[PDB]
Amino acid sequence: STSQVRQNYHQDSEAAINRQINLELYASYVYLSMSYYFDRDDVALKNFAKYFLHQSHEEREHAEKLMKLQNQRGGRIFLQDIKKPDSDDWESGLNAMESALHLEKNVNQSLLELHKLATDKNDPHLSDFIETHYLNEQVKAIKELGDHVTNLRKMGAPESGLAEYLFDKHTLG
Amino acid sequence: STSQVRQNYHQDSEAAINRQINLELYASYVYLSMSYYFDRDDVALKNFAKYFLHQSHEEREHAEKLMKLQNQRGGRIFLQDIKKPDSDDWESGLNAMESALHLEKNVNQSLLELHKLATDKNDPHLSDFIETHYLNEQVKAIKELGDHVTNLRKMGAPESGLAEYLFDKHTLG
Amino acid sequence: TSQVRQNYHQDSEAAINRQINLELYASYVYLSMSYYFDRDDVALKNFAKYFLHQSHEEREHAEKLMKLQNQRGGRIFLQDIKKPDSDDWESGLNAMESALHLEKNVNQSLLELHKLATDKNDPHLSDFIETHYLNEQVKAIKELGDHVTNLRKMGAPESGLAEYLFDKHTLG
Amino acid sequence: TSQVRQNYHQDSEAAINRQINLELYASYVYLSMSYYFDRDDVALKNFAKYFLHQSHEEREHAEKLMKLQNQRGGRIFLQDIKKPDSDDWESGLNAMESALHLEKNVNQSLLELHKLATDKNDPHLSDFIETHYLNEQVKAIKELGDHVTNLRKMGAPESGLAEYLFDKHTLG
Amino acid sequence: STSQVRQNYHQDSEAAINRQINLELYASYVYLSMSYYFDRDDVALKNFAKYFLHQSHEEREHAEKLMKLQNQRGGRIFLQDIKKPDSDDWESGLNAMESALHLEKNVNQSLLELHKLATDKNDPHLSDFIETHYLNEQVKAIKELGDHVTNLRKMGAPESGLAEYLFDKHTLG
Amino acid sequence: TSQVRQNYHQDSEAAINRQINLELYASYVYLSMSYYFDRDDVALKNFAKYFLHQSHEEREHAEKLMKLQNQRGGRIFLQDIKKPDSDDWESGLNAMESALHLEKNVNQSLLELHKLATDKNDPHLSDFIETHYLNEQVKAIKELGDHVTNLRKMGAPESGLAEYLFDKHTLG
Ligand SMILES: [Cl-]
Ligand SMILES: [Cl-]
Ligand SMILES: [Cl-]
Ligand SMILES: [Cl-]
Ligand SMILES: [Cl-]
Ligand SMILES: [Cl-]
Ligand SMILES: [Cl-]
Ligand SMILES: [Cl-]
Ligand SMILES: [Cl-]
Ligand SMILES: [Cl-]
Ligand SMILES: [Cl-]
Ligand SMILES: [Cl-]
Ligand SMILES: [Cl-]
Ligand SMILES: [Cl-]
Ligand SMILES: [Cl-]
Ligand SMILES: [Cl-]
Ligand SMILES: [Cl-]
Ligand SMILES: [Cl-]
Ligand SMILES: [Cl-]
Ligand SMILES: [Cl-]
Ligand SMILES: [Cl-]
Ligand SMILES: [Cl-]
Ligand SMILES: [Mg+2]
Ligand SMILES: [Mg+2]
Ligand SMILES: [Mg+2]
Ligand SMILES: [Mg+2]
Ligand SMILES: [Mg+2]
Ligand SMILES: [Mg+2]
Ligand SMILES: [Mg+2]
Ligand SMILES: [Mg+2]
Ligand SMILES: [Mg+2]
Ligand SMILES: [Mg+2]
Ligand SMILES: [Mg+2]
Ligand SMILES: [Mg+2]
Ligand SMILES: [Mg+2]
Ligand SMILES: [Mg+2]
Ligand SMILES: [Mg+2]
Q: Which one, of D32, D44, D48, lies nearest residue B147 by Cα?
A: D44
What three-state secondary structure class fits E82?
strand
Interface test with B, best of A21, A31, A60, A82 (most B CBs within 10 A): A82
C2 part of a folded domain: no
What residue of B is the nearest CA neighbor of C8?
Answer: B139
B7 part of a folded domain: no
Q: What is the CATH number of the domain that holds C99?
A: 1.20.1260.10
The CA distance from D57 to the nearest CA of chain C, in Å, is 13
The CA distance from C60 to the nearest CA of chain F, in Å, is 26
- Dmax (CA) for chain F in angstroms is 60
DSSP assignment of chain A, as one string?
Answer: ---TT--S--HHHHHHHHHHHHHHHHHHHHHHHHHHHTTSTTT--HHHHHHHHHHHHHHHHHHHHHHHHHHHTT-------BPPPS-S---SHHHHHHHHHHHHHHHHHHHHHHHHHHHHTT-HHHHHHHIIIIIHHHHHHHHHHHHHHHHHHHHTTTT-HHHHHHHHHHT--
What residue of B is the nearest CA neighbor of C6?
Answer: B105
Taking CB atoms and an 8 Å cutoff, what residues of chain E touch A44?
A: 146-148, 150-151
The enclosing H or E element of E28 equals helix E11-37
The CA distance from E112 to the nearest CA of chain B, in Å, is 8
Can you name the residues that pair with C81 across neighbouring β-strands? D81
Which contacts (CB < 8 Å, 24+ apart) does range D152-158 have? D152/D93, D156/D91, D156/D92, D156/D93, D157/D90, D157/D91, D157/D92, D157/D93, D157/D94
B24 marked as binding residue: yes
Is C147 touching E (CB cutoff 8 A)?
A: no
Contacts of C21 (CB under 8 A, 6+ apart): C78, C79, C81
The CA distance from B154 to the nearest CA of chain A, in Å, is 30
What three-state secondary structure class fits D81?
strand
B74: left (phi over 0), alpha (psi -120 to 50) or beta: left
What's the CA gap between A151 and A139, in Å, rounded?
Answer: 19
What's the CA gap between D131 and B91, in Å, rounded?
Answer: 59
Please answer yes or no on whether F40 and C153 come within 8 Å at the CB atom: no
What residue of B is the nearest CA neighbor of C126?
Answer: B131
Residue E25 Cα, ligand 19 centroid: separation in angstroms? Answer: 15
The CA distance from C12 to the nearest CA of chain B, in Å, is 16
Please answer yes or no on whether B143 and C3 come within 8 Å at the CB atom: no
Please answer yes or no on whether F78 and E68 come within 8 Å at the CB atom: no
Residues F51, F34 contacting (CB under 8 angstroms): yes
C-alpha separations of A122 from A10, A68, A116, D98 in Å: 9, 21, 10, 69
Asked if the bond preceding C84 is cis, omega within 30° of 0, the reply is no
Our measurement of the distance from residue C64's CA atom to the centroid of its chain's CA atoms, rounded to an integer in Å, reads 13
What three-state secondary structure class fits B82?
strand
Residues D70, D2 contacting (CB under 8 angstroms): no
Residue type, D8: Y
Please answer yes or no on whether D165 and B163 come within 8 Å at the CB atom: no
Taking CB atoms and an 8 Å cutoff, what residues of chain C touch E124?
A: 111, 114, 118, 126, 129-130, 134
> Where does residue A26 rank: exposed (0-12), middle (13-18), buried (19+ CB within 10 A)?
buried
Taking CB atoms and an 8 Å cutoff, what residues of chain D touch B154?
A: 160-161, 163-164
C4 part of a folded domain: no
Residues E131, B122 contacting (CB under 8 angstroms): no
b/e code F69-82 from CB counts within 10 Å (16+ = b): bbebbbebebeebb
Residue D171, φ and ψ in degrees, nearest 5 = -95, -5
Residues D12, D129 contacting (CB under 8 angstroms): no
CB neighbours of residue F172 within 10 Å: 12
Q: Do chains A and B touch (3 or more CB pairs under 8 A)?
A: yes
What's the CA gap between E167 and E93, in Å, rounded?
Answer: 9
Residue type, E23: L
What's the CA gap between F12 and F22, in Å, rounded?
Answer: 15
Our measurement of the distance from residue B61's CA atom to the centroid of its chain's CA atoms, rounded to an integer in Å, reads 10
What residue of D is the nearest CA neighbor of B142?
Answer: D40
Residues F51, F37 contacting (CB under 8 angstroms): yes
What's the CA gap between D61 and D132, in Å, rounded?
Answer: 9
Residue type, E100: A
Is B112 touching D (CB cutoff 8 A)?
A: no
Query: What distance, in Å, lies between the first and last C-alpha atoms of chain E?
Result: 53
Contacts of A50 (CB under 8 A, 6+ apart): A35, A172
Residues F84, E79 contacting (CB under 8 angstroms): yes
Taking CB atoms and an 8 Å cutoff, what residues of chain A touch B3?
A: 41-42
Is F163 touching C (CB cutoff 8 A)?
A: yes
What's the CA gap between C7 and F100, in Å, rounded?
Answer: 61
Our measurement of the distance from residue F67's CA atom to the centroid of its chain's CA atoms, rounded to an integer in Å, reads 18
Helices B46-72 and E136-155 cross at an angle (nearest 10°) of 70
Residues E121, E10 contacting (CB under 8 angstroms): yes
DSSP assignment of E124-152, as one string?
Answer: HHHHHHHIIIIIHHHHHHHHHHHHHHHHH
Domain that holds residue F86: 11-167
Q: Which one, of F107, F96, F75, lies nearest residue F29 by Cα?
A: F96
Annotate C103-164 with three-state secondary structure.
Answer: HHHHHHHHHHHHHHHHHCCCHHHHHHHHHHHHHHHHHHHHHHHHHHHHHHHHCCCCCHHHHH
C-alpha separations of F88 from B173, C63, C154, F36 in Å: 64, 43, 20, 7
The CA distance from C153 to the nearest CA of chain D, in Å, is 30
What three-state secondary structure class fits C81?
strand
Q: Which of E36, E84, E85 sits opposite F70 (nearest CB)?
A: E36
Helices A93-120 and A46-72 cross at an angle (nearest 10°) of 10
The CA distance from E12 to the nearest CA of chain C, in Å, is 19
Which contacts (CB < 8 Å, 24+ apart) does range C143-146 have? C144/C96, C144/C99, C144/C100, C144/C103, C145/C100, C145/E3, C145/E4, C145/E5, C145/E74, C145/F40, C145/F41, C145/F43, C146/F40, C146/F43, C146/F45
Query: What distance, in Å, lies between the first and last C-alpha atoms of chain B?
Result: 53
Residue type, B103: L
Query: What is the sign, positive or negative, of the torsion defined by CA atoms of F153, F154, F155, F156?
Result: negative
Strands (E), chain D: none
Q: How was this structure determined?
A: X-ray
Residue A82, φ and ψ in degrees, nearest 5 = -95, 115
Taking CB atoms and an 8 Å cutoff, what residues of chain F touch E82?
A: 24, 28, 80-81, 83
CB neighbours of residue E76 within 10 Å: 14
What's the CA gap between F160 and D56, in Å, rounded?
Answer: 42
| Chains touching A by CB (3 or more pairs below 8 Å) | B, E
What's the CA gap between E90 and E96, in Å, rounded?
Answer: 6
Residues F68, F15 contacting (CB under 8 angstroms): no
Residues C35, D70 contacting (CB under 8 angstroms): yes
| Chains touching C by CB (3 or more pairs below 8 Å) | B, D, E, F
Q: Which of B39, B71, B80 sits opposite A36 (nearest CB)?
A: B71
Residues E72, E128 contacting (CB under 8 angstroms): no
Resolution for this PDB entry, in angstroms: 1.8
| Chains touching B by CB (3 or more pairs below 8 Å) | A, C, D, E
| Chains touching E by CB (3 or more pairs below 8 Å) | A, B, C, F
Is C72 touching B (CB cutoff 8 A)?
A: yes
What's the CA gap between F161 and E40, in Å, rounded?
Answer: 52
C-alpha separations of A139 from A17, A107, A131, A136 in Å: 20, 11, 11, 5
CB neighbours of residue D118 within 10 Å: 13
What's the CA gap between D68 and D13, in Å, rounded?
Answer: 10
b/e code A3-13 from CB counts within 10 Å (16+ = b): eeeeeebbeeb
What residue of F is the nearest CA neighbor of E44?
Answer: F70
Please answer yes or no on whether A165 and E146 come within 8 Å at the CB atom: no
Query: What is the sign, positive or negative, of the torsion defined by CA atoms of F22, F28, F29, F34?
Result: positive
Say how many residues make up chain C: 172
Q: Which one, of A166, A52, A171, A86, lies nearest residue B67 by Cα?
A: A52
What residue of A is the nearest CA neighbor of E154?
Answer: A161
B46 part of a folded domain: yes
What three-state secondary structure class fits F81?
strand
C101 part of a folded domain: yes
Helices E161-170 and E46-72 cross at an angle (nearest 10°) of 60
What's the CA gap between A128 and A118, in Å, rounded?
Answer: 9
Q: Do chains B and F touch (3 or more CB pairs under 8 A)?
A: no
Query: What is the sign, positive or negative, of the torsion defined by CA atoms of A107, A109, A112, A114?
Result: negative
What's the CA gap between C67 and C63, in Å, rounded?
Answer: 6
F172 part of a folded domain: no
CB neighbours of residue F60 within 10 Å: 12
Contacts of C36 (CB under 8 A, 6+ apart): C42, C48, C88, C89, C95, D76
b/e code B96-133 from CB counts within 10 Å (16+ = b): bbbbbbebbbebbebbbebbebbbebebbbbbbbbbee
Can you name the residues that pair with F81 across neighbouring β-strands? E82
Please answer yes or no on whether A84 and B88 come within 8 Å at the CB atom: no
Residue D45 Cα, ligand 28 centroid: separation in angstroms? Answer: 28
Give me the number of domains chain E comprises: 1
E2 part of a folded domain: no
Query: What distance, in Å, lies between the first and last C-alpha atoms of chain D?
Result: 51
Q: Which one, of D118, A42, D2, E29, lies nearest residue F76 by Cα?
A: E29
What three-state secondary structure class fits F46?
helix
Which ligand sits closest to the CA of C125? 30
A118 part of a folded domain: yes
Q: Which one, of E56, E138, E158, E44, lies nearest residue E98 by Cα?
A: E158
Q: Do chains B and C touch (3 or more CB pairs under 8 A)?
A: yes
What's the CA gap between D88 and D37, in Å, rounded?
Answer: 10
Our measurement of the distance from residue C143's CA atom to the centroid of its chain's CA atoms, rounded to an integer in Å, reads 13
What's the CA gap between B61 and B25, in Å, rounded?
Answer: 9
The HSE-up count of residue A66 (CA atoms within 13 Å, CB side) is 27
What's the CA gap between E156 and E164, in Å, rounded?
Answer: 8
E138 marked as binding residue: yes
Residues A163, A92 contacting (CB under 8 angstroms): no
Helix and strand totals (H; E) in chain B: 6, 0
What's the CA gap between C159 and C93, in Å, rounded?
Answer: 11
Residue C81, φ and ψ in degrees, nearest 5 = -95, 115
CB neighbours of residue A107 within 10 Å: 22
